[PDB]
Amino acid sequence: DWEYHAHPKPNSXWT
């Protein structure tokens, strides 16, 4: 599997 905990965010680049 490839299940993570701190999985990646969507459009976070717009913060």
UniProtKB/Swiss-Prot annotation:
Q: In which tissues is it expressed?
A: Expressed by the venom duct.
Task: List residues modified as D-phenylalanine.
Answer: X13
What is known about its processing and modification?
The D-Phe is essential to the structural conformation. Since conomarphin is a cysteine-free peptide, hydroxyproline plays a critical role in maintaining a restricted conformation of the peptide.
Q: Which domain of life is it from?
A: Eukaryota
Subcellular location, record wording: Secreted
List other remarks.
Negative results: the unmodified synthetic peptide shows no or weak activity on muscular and neuronal nicotinic acetylcholine receptors (alpha-3-beta-2/CHRNA3-CHRNB2, alpha-3-beta-4/CHRNA3-CHRNB4, alpha-4-beta-2/CHRNA4-CHRNB2, and alpha-1-beta-1-delta-epsilon/CHRNA1-CHRNB1-CHRND-CHRNE). The mature peptide does not contain cysteine residues.
| Protein family membership | Belongs to the conotoxin M superfamily.
Function description: May act as a neurotoxin.
What is the protein name given in its UniProt record?
Answer: Conomarphin-Mr3
